[PDB]
Structure formats: structure tokens, C-alpha cells
Design an enzyme around this catalytic site. Structure first.
Site, PDB file in Angstrom:
ATOM      1  N   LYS D 175      13.711  30.679   7.777  1.00 22.09           N
ATOM      2  CA  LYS D 175      12.690  30.700   8.822  1.00 22.09           C
ATOM      3  C   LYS D 175      11.314  30.859   8.162  1.00 22.09           C
ATOM      4  O   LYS D 175      10.945  31.964   7.758  1.00 22.09           O
ATOM      5  CB  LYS D 175      12.962  31.908   9.743  1.00 22.09           C
ATOM      6  CG  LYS D 175      12.556  31.763  11.211  1.00 22.09           C
ATOM      7  CD  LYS D 175      11.048  31.657  11.387  1.00 22.09           C
ATOM      8  CE  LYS D 175      10.344  32.999  11.213  1.00 22.09           C
ATOM      9  NZ  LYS D 175       8.856  32.795  11.226  1.00 22.09           N
ATOM     10  N   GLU D 251       9.885  42.130  -0.727  1.00 17.48           N
ATOM     11  CA  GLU D 251       8.609  42.264  -1.420  1.00 17.48           C
ATOM     12  C   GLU D 251       7.555  42.351  -0.331  1.00 17.48           C
ATOM     13  O   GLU D 251       7.467  41.465   0.516  1.00 17.48           O
ATOM     14  CB  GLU D 251       8.335  41.088  -2.356  1.00 17.48           C
ATOM     15  CG  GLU D 251       7.010  41.243  -3.125  1.00 17.48           C
ATOM     16  CD  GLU D 251       5.849  40.565  -2.414  1.00 17.48           C
ATOM     17  OE1 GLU D 251       4.945  41.263  -1.915  1.00 17.48           O
ATOM     18  OE2 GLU D 251       5.847  39.317  -2.348  1.00 17.48           O
ATOM     19  N   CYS D 285      -0.287  38.739  -2.037  1.00 11.77           N
ATOM     20  CA  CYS D 285       0.182  40.125  -2.095  1.00 11.77           C
ATOM     21  C   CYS D 285      -0.298  40.842  -3.356  1.00 11.77           C
ATOM     22  O   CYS D 285      -0.495  42.059  -3.360  1.00 11.77           O
ATOM     23  CB  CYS D 285       1.715  40.164  -2.042  1.00 11.77           C
ATOM     24  SG  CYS D 285       2.501  39.221  -3.390  1.00 11.77           S
ATOM     25  N   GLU D 387      -4.080  47.568   3.152  1.00 12.09           N
ATOM     26  CA  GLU D 387      -4.088  46.155   2.757  1.00 12.09           C
ATOM     27  C   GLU D 387      -4.881  45.311   3.755  1.00 12.09           C
ATOM     28  O   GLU D 387      -4.542  45.263   4.937  1.00 12.09           O
ATOM     29  CB  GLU D 387      -2.655  45.619   2.634  1.00 12.09           C
ATOM     30  CG  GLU D 387      -2.561  44.129   2.257  1.00 12.09           C
ATOM     31  CD  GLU D 387      -1.121  43.637   2.105  1.00 12.09           C
ATOM     32  OE1 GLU D 387      -0.386  43.629   3.119  1.00 12.09           O
ATOM     33  OE2 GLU D 387      -0.726  43.251   0.977  1.00 12.09           O
TER      34      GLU D 387
HETATM   35  O1  LIG Z   1       2.122  36.902  -1.584  1.00 13.78           O
HETATM   36  C1  LIG Z   1       3.041  37.522  -2.424  1.00 13.78           C
HETATM   37  C2  LIG Z   1       3.275  36.923  -3.775  1.00 13.78           C
HETATM   38  C3  LIG Z   1       4.469  36.334  -4.095  1.00 13.78           C
HETATM   39  C4  LIG Z   1       4.675  35.770  -5.458  1.00 13.78           C
HETATM   40  C5  LIG Z   1       6.045  35.448  -5.940  1.00 13.78           C
HETATM   41  O2  LIG Z   1       7.056  35.849  -5.355  1.00 13.78           O
HETATM   42  C6  LIG Z   1       6.202  34.629  -7.176  1.00 13.78           C
HETATM   43  O3  LIG Z   1       5.198  34.187  -7.813  1.00 13.78           O
HETATM   44  O4  LIG Z   1       7.368  34.396  -7.572  1.00 13.78           O
END
Ligand SMILES: O=C/C=C/C=C(\O)C(=O)O
Ligand SMILES: NC(=O)c1ccc[n+]([C@@H]2O[C@H](COP(=O)([O-])OP(=O)(O)OC[C@H]3O[C@@H](n4cnc5c(N)ncnc54)[C@H](O)[C@@H]3O)[C@@H](O)[C@H]2O)c1
Ligand SMILES: NC(=O)c1ccc[n+]([C@@H]2O[C@H](COP(=O)([O-])OP(=O)(O)OC[C@H]3O[C@@H](n4cnc5c(N)ncnc54)[C@H](O)[C@@H]3O)[C@@H](O)[C@H]2O)c1
Ligand SMILES: O=C/C=C/C=C(\O)C(=O)O
Ligand code: NA
Ligand code: NA
Ligand code: NA
Ligand code: NA
Lengths: 484, 483, 483, 483
Positions: D175, D251, D285, D387
Site C-alpha cells: 500500500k 523506521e 527522515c 519533527e
Molecule cells: O524517509 C526515510 C528514509 C529512508 C531511506 C531508506 O530506507 C534507504 O535509503 O534505504
């Protein structure tokens, strides 16, 4: 007919002298091969040393792996040409070349390219007396120039088995294929050239051993390592030759391998399996079973079954309908094998089948064919049961006890491979661990996962290759310690 | 004092014996029994048979526990081992107490622990019939390991080989240097007293050619030969074992460089190079006999090191504040002094040392030399290219990073290198370009026993330490099950 | 007779206490001080603070040494630990002496050893500017680990979590089952006497919901919650730590099958299934409560198992020849007996057992039940699908290999399976198709502490053991240096 | 255009649809069909069934070959994927061509390669009877992987989850963000054309609560949920899957710091922090919203960064030398501008930016904001602790190394940190002390796909990347054979 040139510093070059490449199917001349002299070997080594400082040395691991995949693509694109080349040199069945030899050469390059992309090294943290600590990390770097010397049993497969990880690890290469089987290696040089592999990175030198290109290569102080597959005694010779320079070495040196068939084996499968392990490539594989031990309770049925299946084998032309076996590599090798056929009779063997030369009554009689051969009745100490013949032959002996047969298998100056046939779970794992060899197969033979360690013990070898073992052998492992 | 062989669970004498001489004063320490060919054969056969006895039937955990007991045995007789090592070699008692003996104990404990925790691999594959196959690897004992070790760090190096060999389930025939036989003999006593089965650990005394060392390398019954010592001896041994295609592992010394960049902590670098040049009176394979210092700090560096070099106390092993003992032997001093003279003939400036100290006591009958610093030689000078194995270093200025990398690498050897810099990028960029097995940054001879240890070019073959030892001292076997 | 909390280096009482009851005879063993929310907070804060203290500064070698001293401390008081475990649970003294206490010691030693030998990774990469970069990983303490353990194998399971937690340099707040508080309290004393710094190990007693367990899971100061127990409790804890995104690791029991093929060693399989069904009175998460037997040996298997089950001596932990003690509590017996009744109502044939033994002594005041075997139920019966956690198994025949694989896998649980066969291909082919975390072939509950341990589906989340514990109880950080 | 769901090998519409809006100019790009609960169920069931189809019968080699063909398919339509990513999000065309699309390709290739080369473990053990046992581990598909992804790096983050899921032989219900549905829909076309069997990859469109995202997390047929996005959402999802004890990997963004030490290459650090604060208009992020600069270089750093920030070109995705496009949406801009106001209210000095650019064309109907720098806020201000996910950073001076480590760590988040220093010791000493999953030294967002990637505290649970993904997306099973 055709001419096979050396490939040195990005150029195909001839030589002052040439030798004949002979088709073992019919004894006919296939090509002239230009024999590299000492000066040309030096030129190749020097070119390899210099190429380490050129574009090749600057490639990222990813770009290097990509180029190695291009080498594999180039072989695949000329697949039938390589099949034809391997067959012409050795007489091997076209089906074998199309299913084992050439696919494995492609797979060698792809697998080591992939391993190079994915492999990593180690980080070790430690405390120190001042309380600030230190970091130790390891790196893999190219070892330098790799000297490769390969034999005629599986010409392109064995050549690329060494060349592939050498290049994957960022080394440069000087490689000397068997004088009996120079064609596919020469085609490979063309693929390398066309793929854009920088000059000096891969160098192909043709010739013999003593007083020829092979000896010149092992004695050159410019190499960093010598990796070799061939006769045990040649391994010893090479080990002495490189000793003054303390060069890294890796040897796979054949053997006198056993198959063991326990009373609980699937008997038909075992008969088929031993047929394969004894007579594949007309017995000309380091891994072939020349000793077979069969439980007393099934011994007669096993021997009768194998006789029938061996006599069913079609020995003939590489592209003949239903062909199973081609000739031996050369008349000279046939001389060795026939001398053992004679010796077995002198030592008191019963010749169950074979024992001689087939009569074709056509041009193949000028070739180097022998019959698949089965012996019984020799003691464990007979020469024919202890010395490597490298022909399509096996001696079969009964046994009664598991510990007994384990000791008999291990009573050998060699220790390359063993194949065990049993349907019993505990037996498979218990027995396999006790066999003193580098490689055990259970209910199969010569099933290969290229990631696994491959090599032998005793006179059968030094070192391991395959997977991480190749990544380590073809690399300088350096430890870097940072005081923090 | 008498030092006997230890063969098949028994201490035995020989028809021949030789002198063990204290290098501090030239006095006799012990008579040592030299194993003959018959005894070497007895030892190898005993070791072959021990693989089939109680040792061969121990679980990995019980084997590791017994190895920790060997370590306990050394610890329990700690000062005895200290005194044995000092008597043989003249090393400072403080060095013996902090480096040599504790490392011997740590060698046994580390490889015992590695053996307990180590594992192997499982590979799954598909096959034509759709049923698949599994390949798994196992580590098994290689068989009988021949160990031949040198006099530089006797017990440390002896046990550096013996510990992983035993941890991997092998049996061992071990030959310590004729110059340093004492601590290995006490180890045989500890092994006996810990209840190590007869034949598992065998100790043979003697020399190289026409003696126990050569006989061991020629014996068809061994499965490997692991060796630390001179490069030419490695070559000789490699030829000796070739007909039996024996596994080999060699660490062969070198001509190591230290590099001091302009951005180094200068005081730390002076102290570090003093350490790397003069530790154990410079008798370590890892010592820096070549030093490159950036031109901008060259004079200050040389002056500083001279001062520190001349503050070193050369004397008795237990003497107050002693820094340096003698060389191992008068024979070795003859070699070193021959190099001291050669340096002058080659046009070197002797910044300090260059001779032997005068004590006016028994020490004058020993094998002492002075810590020595040279400058002014070219990179091709014999004294800057050949391993001396004494307390000496030549110092040469450099200007550029790529230049000094090439000068460090311009060597037939390639064991170790020490780099001094405070710059992050420089440390990692330069370290990776040095053609050696071992680089230290802002330190020297800092050892994590898990790391790969060894050299390139004439400095060695193979790696030991951690998993590299677990692999070398094992048969690696692949078992393929067709399902 | 009184069990205290251990918080920040001190044994402390609480406002409330609850009874510790001997299930052999229903007698009171001790009063246990129940930690309130305030003491739970005190424990977590102390554990956070200890991370900044002497514990935080210890080298990995010094940390491992200390953990070995904890193990030594348990070994020095071995019989006291045995007595403690036996008192709380009624387990046979022999089991406690051979399984429970030695495993607790092995837990500490093994993870100490793994801490000493484990390393991390180095990755090199190229960059646009041609200078490259280095990525290396490190393992650091995760922080404060909350440990909640059950009553099944009290000290074994408690230390299975506490040992890797401490080996990885964490500090700990641990809550043992209210049913089995004694050995954990003795462990606190060993920690104290071993000189484990205050705050590093904290013991809190209490229940779950509305008590010490709940409070711990809801505290924002922990970094992880590891838990072994009931599946629905796992779900509750997962929700509780969610707002903090805490790391979690769960082992949650199951409804495990044993499978006996026609080619099995029948006597071995019978003994094997006796062990897997009735060990610890069937109170292990790994026990086989479902059994599938090939129809050719079904009648013989069931007859043989009935005979062996009826030979089991059920009684006192120190009784001559005792095989089985009581269930953990009267309340647990109530659940188990509810299932015994349900089975009959569901149409089960009771092959053996099915009730409570009559001892005509104080054991009648305890929580005993009979070892029980059923046949004749559908695969969809509640007694064949729901975890009972008692000394019971249902046995069903099967005909085909693919059939039995599907019946084994037809479950919302997936912890373990035991398969009995002498066929090589069958063992490997079938084992890989079973949807569980753990398969044993021709054995049961044989444990190598290096291996990954855990379940799938409702039986768990994550793996522990070996490197999986080293990873879980650590912060894994990647450090990338541009050169 | 129109964006359909992809379920069981077919593109399908839905009862409800929603708008996809270009943030450059506020124009409608496409209609998107929102999957309902019925359709989510159809996708999960299709995924479960596909495990039993031709997909589940493929060798690892054939599976990896197919995944490489997926990668080939994206490459063959490279510019179509670029246009799609750019249309949805407004990201610079150069960024899409160098970061976003190449990473999607590399995600598939790397995990295909890791699948081909990865292996598992073999452990040997001794047993009572002396026959021994072997434990081997295998990696099997976990089952159906639910993937929920955000709009920051649409295809990169989508494929970061989908690639290892497929490489490990799972099937997928995925999704993508309602804000960026295009490239995922194109990926469905690629899979279809590559011959990926029906049910193996399923794409469902929609929102979170009461929509496709929530329905997926609540479905009992999934085996895991992997998710990247807001921390609060991770918490919600962790609760949603708790009843099924589903494996989870999160994450969750953060409040990352950059640290510039006095010994940094100042120009490089200014450029570095420009990149880390304003890349993708600060919508990553990993972006630095907190910056700490040594007092001694603070003024020079802030002036330098102000100038470079003011040279940034903000405009059209394919505009000449554009550096920043708009934010993802007007809704997100509302959030970001709300923080811009709050910073002023909290007493910040607006060094640059703080508003929205005036273009006087269609971009004024878009969602643009100015890159912004603040100074003068406390470490506890909301704008320094929450954030924002926009192109902003606050810069604060510091004096001491230990001080700044504490200030960086003083956060409920812990995803990443970038450190600028030329000092060797400082790089390694400091990096190891930062409580985050990812540290960069003298760079930022330099990625080696083999390394562990994840955060601590509220920034995540678990690690992905390399072996960590191979473990997460697999069932790890231990098979113990008693010999
Ligand atoms: O916005 C969050 C960043 C994610 C980056 C990754 O998971 C990557 O570069 O593998
Ligand atoms: N790599 C090192 O750590 C190391 C240590 C000591 C000496 N060295 C070097 O070598 C010189 C020392 O002289 P050395 O004679 O003691 O060194 P060596 O290498 O010849 O002796 C080392 C060990 O090998 C044995 N040995 C010697 N010849 C042998 C042979 N032909 N076969 C089997 N074993 C043999 C010796 O008995 C001794 O035990 C030094 O000047 C130094 O340069 C290096
Ligand atoms: N996986 C196992 O090894 C295991 C062990 C014991 C019991 N069980 C199962 O669960 C049943 C036992 O009931 P139980 O109450 O002892 O198991 P439980 O899972 O509810 O309790 C286990 C541990 O978790 C604690 N706990 C309980 N509720 C909690 C909560 N809401 N928050 C935090 N901690 C909480 C308990 O106090 C105890 O320490 C058995 O019938 C059996 O089916 C499984
Ligand atoms: O004289 C050579 C020194 C070798 C050092 C080691 O082998 C070691 O420290 O392990
Ligand atoms: Na030929
Ligand atoms: Na001496
Ligand atoms: Na109790
Ligand atoms: Na959009």
C-alpha cells in the site's frame, strides 16, 4: 587448419614455435598452437603487474563485477562455439559439453562476480590500557598477479574456476591451459578482448610444463600466487618452484576416491550413481570413483547390475545418438591407462567387463578410446587399487562392517572425495563425518554448489577454494588497527 | 638444569645434548637433550595414535575445558615461567611479566573460547528432480601439527601455534628454538600435570638442519607445518614438505617501516617509534627498522628520539628501571655488529649507539649491544633493506604522501607498518595502500587475537588468528546430501 | 520464608506481600513482597543510572569475567538453588539437578563466551570522488532490558534472558513469575556477592495485570521487553510497549506435534514421546500435546506408550524413582482438569489417566494430576487445538506424508515439532516443510544454546540464542566514514 | 491518468476513487481507486494462495533471475518512472534520475544478489550417548508480507521493502502513500510484463484509518508488517497487529542532528549541512533539523550557510539548476508553515527563509516554501524537539565534545547523525557515543545497501538492509538431527 595464438597485453600474438592440437576421436590435427617462450611469459607477467596500476585497478567492485558478468554474457553469446571447441580438443560428448562444461564456465564468472558484490569483512573492537580503545578492521585487496595452471580434464570449467575468482578479487592473471586442451581458453581470450577487459588484465600463454610456459610461469618472481589443478607430483614440483619467493599456493591434486554402497542403499540408484561416478568423462575427473566398496549381502547383485549398465554404455562420436563416453584425452594418456589395465591382470584381477580397447573398424581406431572397465578380486594393497589411473575404471570389493569400510576408505595416501549410498538418516551423517576427504556426497556424486569449500586432504591438495575460501585465497587480507 | 624431550607422555633424554647459555653473562643454564630421527619418529607416531585415543573422543566443550586447565597450570606457576623465559633470553623481567607470559595464557584461553563458540555453514540448493540438496561444512582436526618456533618471543610464539592446534582437536609435535628451550619444557610439565593424554602434546629439542627441526619437516606422518622465523628458513621448509603436500603457515619477519606525517602528535610518535624500534632489544619480527618522517619535523623528531634512546637503561633483567636486556646470543650479536659496521661503510651517520656498552662486570661476557639510530642512507642501502633483528632503526625524510607509500612498499618484505597521523582521511587512505598484512595507526603491536595476522611477499604465507587459525588448524569438509 | 525485591544494590521489602505455595502439599513456603509502581520506577531509574556507572566503563573482557563469576556463584550454592526450584514447583530433585540448575549456569557461561568472541562487520564502497567510504557496524548496549519470565522452567528461562542481557552490557529489571519467585531471589544474592554494581541487576516481584509486570511493560525508561509465557499475554505486552516503540522478543508456547513414521525406531519413538509429553508434568512450551502415528504402528505405539506412562512414578520430588511432580498450582490444575473433562465430552477415548491420583497423604492437598493419553478426537476438537500445558497428549493415526505435514501445520501456533524416522530423505524433506521455529528429528528438547530459538504464528516474534541474542540485546549501529 | 489496484494478476477499479494532485501547481494528475476491505481481503488471500503456486516452486536461482528481470523492466522504462515520481511529488528531475529511480533498480538487484549468495548455519554438538547431533538453520519465506510506505522517497522506499520480501520468496500486499501512488502502479505493470505469477505482488491504494492501510494491518492472513513513516503511526500499527503477534519492522523518522567540530573542513561542512537540511526540500527522515557548531566557528558557519541557502534555486522539477521543488502537498505545507510561525513565537531569529517564495506564475498555486535557518532557541523548544519534515534547521553553538554528545542524545528520537571533523580519533570516539542507528562522518545519506539501517527510541524497531533484511523477511528455522 586453425591456429591458436597467445593473448598478451591486449594483443593476440604468435610465437617462434608451435605444437599440434590432436583430436582424440580420430587422431587428426585440429590446430597449431603457438608456444609462449620465456620472453613472452615475462612480457605477460610484466603486463599483468602494470595493469594493476591502470584502469582495472581503479574500478569499483561494482564496475568490476559488471564487467565480469559481461565476460559471462560473451561466452553465452558464443555458446555453441565454445561447445564445439571443448569437444574438438577432448572428444567429450556434445551433451556433456552443453550441460556441464560450458554452463559451469558461465556460472563460474557469474557466481564469483556476485560474491564479490556481496562479500564483506570484519570489525573487531578492543579495550586498551589508557581506556580509549582501538578498532581493528580487515580489508580484502587484490593479491596481485595470479598465475593459473589448469589441466585437460574439464578444460574451460577448471580454467574459469580459477580465472573467475582471480578477476572478481581485482587481481590480474597469467594463465596457461593444458597443451592438450587449448581451444576454449583461446576463445575465452577473444571474449575478454571483445568485452573491453583492459590490456594486461588477462593474459593467455600456451605451452607445456617443464622447459616451457608452465615452468617459466611458476618460476617468475613477478607473480603473487600460483593456483593449480593437476597431478599430485606436479603440485609438489610447483610448490618447490615457488618456495624461494614464498608465493601463496592453492592445489587440487586428484585422488583415488571411493564409493561406498551400504546394504540399505536404493540399489538401482546406487548402480546408476556408481556408473556415473566411475565413467563420467570416460573416468577423467579427479573426483571419479576408482574404488568401490559394496556390502557383502548385495555385492553379487551390485556387480552384475553394474556390468550390464556399463556394457549398455555407448562409446563413440561426441554427437553420436545416445553417446555416453568419448575417448581418453590422448594416445599418451591411453598408454598409461592400458598399462594399468595390464597391471590389474598381472596383480590377479578378475576382469568383469572391459579391460581393453573397443574395435570400431573406422577412423576412431586411430583415436584414443578405451573400454569402461570393472575389476574384482584385488587386495586393498594392489597398485591398481591405490594409484590414480584417471581412466574409466573401478575395482569393486565387498565389506561387512561400517567401521571396517570407513577404515578401508581412509587407508589411502589421497583424500579428495567420497560418495556414499544409504537410505539411513543416522548412517548418512555418522559415516560422512568420518571419511578423511575434502568432499563427501550422499546418494549423488559431483553435485556442485559453487559457494561451498572445495579441495582435498593428504596428497589430494592444499587449501580450499569455492565461496569465501576463494574470496580469501585470491585476496590480500590486511588488518588495520586504529588506536583511538 | 636439564631439559628433556617429552614424548608419548614421558620425559626422555637423548644420546646427544647441547648447551643452553644465559646471554646476560654467558653462563651455562642447562643441558638440553637433542631429539634424534628415531625420537622424532616416535613423537609423530605417538601423536598419530593419540588422535585415536581418549583425546579424540572428547567433546569440543570438554576439550576446551581441558585447554583452560592448561592455562590455569601456567598461571599457577607464573613466576616459574617468567624466570625460565628471562634466563633463556635476557628479556626484562617486567616485559616477561606483562607481555610474554600473560599472552601465553591468553593464547590458550582465547582459542579455547573460539573453539566453543565457532560454527560452520549450511548451503541449500535446487536439483533437476525438484527435491533439492543440502551442503554443510564441518571442521575436523587436521591431524598431527608440526610446530617450529623461534627465540624472539619464545612462549608467546610457541603457544600461539600450540593453542589453536589443540583447540581444533589436533595432536602436536613441537620444536622450540635451541636458543630458548626452557619455557616450552615447563609447558610440557603443565600439560602432563593437567592430565593431557599421552601423545597429544610432544616436545622435541634440537636444531634445524641435520637435527630435530629438519627431521620433523621431513616426516610423512605430520599433516601441517606451522613456522615463524627467518624467510629463507620458510623457503627451505616449504620445499621440505612439498612431496607430502603438507599444509603450511609461515610468518617470516620483514623490514618494517614506521611513517610519521607532519600532522602526527609528535611526542606520541617519538615514544611510539622508540617502542617499535627497541622493544625486546629490537628482536621482534614486527619492529620498525625503517622510519620515514616528514621533512618539516625531521630534525625535531630525530633529536627527540636520540634523547629518549639514550635514556634507555641497558642492563640486568631485574635491574631497577631496566629497558633493554642483551641480544639472544653471541652469534646473533655477531650478525648485528656486522650490520653496525656495514652501516658506517655505507656512509651512515650514527645518531646514537653503534657499539656495545661497557659494564665492567659479568655482563661483558654476555651479548649486549647499544640501541642505535642511523640517518643518511639511500633506500637501496643493505642496512635499510635487509632484516637486522637488532635494536636499530634508520630514519629518512620524505615530502609527499604518495612518495612515502611507494618507499614503504619498495621492499621484498611486507609484514607490518606503523603510521602516525591525526588526520581522519589520511589514516584510512594511507593505511589501505600499504602492502603489508598488518597496519597500526598511532600505536604499534596492539594485538586483538581474533584478527588475521600474517604477511605478504617474503614475509609470509597464510594468516593465523581468530577464524583464520580455526580454519588452518582444521580439515574443512563439505558434506552434500541429495534429498 | 520472606522473598524481597532487589533494587539498586539493596534488598527491599514492599507494602504488600503474597503467598508462595508448595504445589506438592499446598503449604506456605514464603511471603513475597510485591513491587508497586513506585518501586518499579525506582528499579528502572537505577538501571538507567547504572548504565553511566562502573558497569558502563567495563571492557567486554572484564564484563564477561564478571558474568563467569555469577555462574561460579550459582555453582558454589548449587544445592540451595536446587532446593529453591524444587520448593516452588514440585519438580523432581533429579530434574532440577540435571536440567534446571546446570542450564542456568550454562546460560551465563555461554553468553559470556559469545560476548568475548563476537565481532561485527566492515563494508567498503566506492564514491563519486574516487576516495571511497568505510561502513562499519558496532554492537552497543540497547539500554535497560525489562525481563518477564514464566513458571515453567523458572531459573532456566529467567537466566536465558538475563544472561544475554548482561553479556551485551545492558542493565536489567526482571520480574519472575509470582508462582516461582525463589530461585530468582537467590540469583539476586549471587549478583550482590559477585560484586555486580548497584542498579545493573534489579529484581521486582509481583503479578501481571495491575501489578509489577504491567508497570514494567508500561515504563518509558526501558529499551526492550523480552517475554516468555502465554500467547495472549504476548499480545497484551506488545500493545503496552507500542507507544514507546520498544524492541520486543516473544516466545509464546504452542500446540506442538510429534510425528512417528512407519520407519521410525518404534521403541525410541515411544520413549521419545513419553519424554516430550510428560517432562515437567507436561508443563513446557515445547511439549507434544498432539501426536500423529502411522497407522501400521498405531496400535503398537499407543499400547507401548500406555504401558510406559503407567510406569511413571508420580510423587514427591525426593521420592525414590519419582518421574513426575505436581502441576505448578491449584489454579493451573483447575484449567488442566477442565480440559480433561472437555476431552471426554468431545468424544475422546481415555487411554490412560484422565483424573487426579489418590495418595491418601499430604500430596492430596497439592496440585497433582495423572499423565493422560487420549485417542479418537477430530483435528478440530478444542482439546487438540488449544494449549493445555499439562501432562497430556492426543494420538491420531495418519497414512500419508503430505497429509501429516498439513495436519501438523493446521494450527494457529507454530513453536516446535518432533519427527521420528530412520529415512534420510524423509527427515530432511519433512523437517523443512513444518511451519515451526524448531524441529527435532529422533529426539526432543536437545538444546545447543548457539542456535536460533523461537516460534512462528501465535508462538512468537523474533529469535533468541547465539547471534540472535547478541543482536537483540544490542543496539546495532552503522558508522559511515567518507574518506 | 488513472491508477488501478493490482490484485491476483489483474488491474481492478474500486467503488471509491481519490485525487492525485501535482504539488508544483495544484493540478489534478490522476484518479486513484481506493481499495475497500473486501479488496484487501482478496489481495491477502491471493497472496496466500500464490505461495502454493508456481512462485513457491521456484529455485532461489530462478527467483533471483525473475527479480533481476523486474529490475530490467524498470530500467527499460527509466524515464517513465522518473516522470511518474516527479509528477506526484515535485522532486527535482535530477534527483529522480540519480537517486530515486536508480535506487529502486539497485534495491531489486542487491536483494536478488544477496538471495543468491546468502547461506545459513551449521552447529555440531555432543550428546550423552556419544553419537552427537547436528543443528542446521534454514531461511524460508515468512509468508505474506504487508508493506506500507510513505511519500518521502516513494519508489525507493516502496522497493526497499518489496525487493527483499520477494527475494526471500514471500508474496506481497503493498500500500503506497496516497500522496505518491504513480511509480508503484507502474511497478505493478513491470511485474505483470515480467511474468511474475498472479497473487505474488498485489498493489492496493488508499489511506490509513478506515481505509486500505488499516485494513491490511488488521488482516489475520498476513505474516508481517513492514512500515516507514510517522512514529505515532508505527505505534498504531504495532497495536493493530498485536493480536496476531505479527513480525514487525519500523523506521519512524526523527529529529536528527548534524555536528560541526572546530576542526571540520568548514566549506565542506557548510555544503554538507546544506545537503542534509534541504535535500528533497527537507522531506527525508534522515535530514538534519538540529545543528550544533563549535562556538569558535559558529558565526562563520552560520553566515556561510545563510549565503549558500540563499543561492538555492527553488522552482520547477526540470528548471535550470533547480535545487528544491515544493513540499509534497498543501496539507503538509500547512504543517510546515505552522512550525515556521511557532519558531518565531518561541523566540527564534530567522537567519533566512521563514515564508513562501513569490513566483508570480502557476507555482503560486503549488505547495512551495523557502529553505529556512533558525538560531536562538533553547534545546527544549518545540521547533528543536519535534519533527517538522520541511527544509529547515536550527543552529546552536556548543563548547565541549562531551557536552555536544549529551545534547545530540537528549531526544526521544534516534535515527541518524552527521558529524564533521578532520580528526581521526574524534571521528571514531564520537560516532560510537551517538545514540542513533546511523552515523555519517564528513558526508550524509551515503548508502551501502548491505549495512544495517534503522533507528533507536521512537525512530524505529528492528534493522533492515543486507543480512538484516534476509533475516526479517524469512522464517528462521532450526532443524536438529540426533545422529
Ligand atoms: O524517509 C526515510 C528514509 C529512508 C531511506 C531508506 O530506507 C534507504 O535509503 O534505504
Ligand atoms: N619472524 C621472526 O619472528 C624471527 C624470529 C627469530 C629470528 N628471525 C630471523 O632469523 C634470524 C635468526 O636465526 P635463526 O637460525 O634462529 O632463525 P631460523 O628461522 O633459522 O630458526 C627458527 C626455528 O626454525 C628452526 N630451523 C632452522 N632451520 C631449520 C630447518 N632447515 N628445518 C627445520 N627447522 C629449522 C630452528 O631450529 C628454530 O627452531 C634472525 O636474524 C632474524 O632475522 C625471525
Ligand atoms: N511459553 C511458556 O513457556 C509458558 C509458560 C507458562 C505458561 N504458559 C501458558 O500460559 C498459561 C499460564 O498462565 P500464566 O498467567 O502463568 O501465564 P502468563 O503469560 O499470563 O504469565 C507469564 C508472566 O507474565 C506475567 N504477566 C501476566 N500478565 C501480564 C501482563 N498483563 N503484563 C505484564 N506481565 C504479565 C506473569 O506475571 C508472569 O511473570 C498456561 O496455561 C500456559 O498455557 C506458557
Ligand atoms: O617475532 C615475531 C612476532 C610475532 C607476533 C605474534 O605472532 C603475535 O603477537 O601473535
Ligand atoms: Na587435443
Ligand atoms: Na639461551
Ligand atoms: Na509456588
Ligand atoms: Na501527489
Amino acid at each position: 587448419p586453425s591456429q591458436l595464438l597467445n593473448y598478451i597485453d591486449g594483443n593476440f600474438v604468435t610465437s617462434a614455435s608451435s605444437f599440434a592440437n590432436i583430436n582424440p576421436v580420430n587422431g587428426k590435427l585440429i590446430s597449431d598452437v603457438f608456444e609462449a617462450d620465456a620472453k613472452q611469459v615475462n612480457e605477460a607477467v610484466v603486463a599483468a603487474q602494470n595493469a594493476l596500476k591502470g584502469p582495472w585497478g581503479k574500478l569499483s567492485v561494482q564496475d568490476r563485477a559488471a564487467l565480469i558478468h559481461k565476460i559471462a554474457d560473451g561466452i553465452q553469446a558464443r555458446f555453441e562455439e565454445f561447445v564445439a571447441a571443448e569437444v574438438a580438443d577432448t572428444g567429450r560428448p556434445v551433451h556433456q559439453a552443453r550441460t556441464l562444461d560450458i554452463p559451469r564456465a558461465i556460472a563460474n564468472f557469474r557466481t564469483f562476480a556476485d560474491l564479490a558484490k556481496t562479500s564483506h569483512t570484519d570489525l573487531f573492537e578492543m579495550s586498551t590500557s589508557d581506556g580509549s580503545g582501538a578498532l581493528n578492521y580487515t580489508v580484502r585487496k587484490p593479491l596481485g598477479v595470479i598465475g593459473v595452471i589448469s589441466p585437460w580434464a574439464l578444460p574451460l570449467l577448471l580454467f574459469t574456476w580459477k580465472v573467475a575468482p582471480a578477476l572478481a578479487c581485482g587481481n590480474t592473471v597469467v594463465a596457461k591451459p593444458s597443451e592438450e586442451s587449448p581451444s576454449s581458453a583461446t576463445l575465452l581470450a577473444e571474449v575478454m578482448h571483445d568485452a573491453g577487459v583492459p590490456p594486461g588484465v588477462f593474459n593467455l600463454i600456451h605451452g607445456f610444463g617443464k622447459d616451457s610456459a608452465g615452468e617459466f610461469l611458476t618460476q617468475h618472481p613477478g607473480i603473487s600466487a600460483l593456483t593449480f589443478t593437476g597431478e599430485s607430483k606436479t603440485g609438489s614440483t610447483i610448490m618447490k618452484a615457488v618456495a624461494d619467493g614464498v608465493k601463496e599456493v592453492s592445489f587440487e591434486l586428484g585422488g583415488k576416491n571411493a564409493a561406498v554402497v551400504f546394504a540399505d542403499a536404493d540399489l538401482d540408484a546406487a548402480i546408476e550413481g556408481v556408473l556415473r561416478s566411475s565413467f563420467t568423462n570416460s573416468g577423467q575427473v579427479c573426483l571419479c570413483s576408482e574404488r568401490v566398496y559394496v556390502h557383502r549381502s548385495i555385492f553379487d547383485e551390485f556387480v552384475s547390475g553394474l556390468k550390464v549398465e556399463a556394457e549398455r554404455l555407448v562409446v563413440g562420436y561426441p554427437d553420436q545418438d545416445g553417446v555416453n563416453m568419448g575417448p581418453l584425452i590422448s594416445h599418451g594418456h591411453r598408454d598409461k591407462v592400458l598399462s594399468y589395465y595390464r597391471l590389474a591382470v598381472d596383480e590377479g584381477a578378475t576382469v568383469v567387463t572391459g579391460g581393453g580397447v573397443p574395435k570400431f573398424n573406422d577412423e576412431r581406431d586411430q583415436g584414443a578410446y578405451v573400454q569402461p572397465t570393472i575389476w574384482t578380486g584385488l587386495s586393498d594393497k594392489a597398485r591398481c587399487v591405490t594409484e590414480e589411473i584417471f581412466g574409466p575404471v573401478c575395482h569393486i570389493s565387498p565389506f561387512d562392517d561400517e567401521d571396517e569400510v570407513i577404515n578401508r576408505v581412509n587407508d589411502s595416501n589421497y583424500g579428495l572425495a567420497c560418495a556414499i549410498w544409504t537410505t539411513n538418516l543416522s548412517r548418512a551423517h555418522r559415516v560422512s563425518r568420518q571419511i578423511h576427504v575434502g568432499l563427501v556426497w550422499v546418494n549423488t556424486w559431483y553435485l556442485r554448489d559453487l559457494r561451498t569449500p572445495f579441495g582435498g586432504v593428504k596428497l589430494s591438495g592444499l587449501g580450499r577454494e569455492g565461496g569465501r575460501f576463494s574470496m580469501d585465497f585470491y585476496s590480500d587480507i590486511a588488518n588495520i588497527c586504529i588506536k583511538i
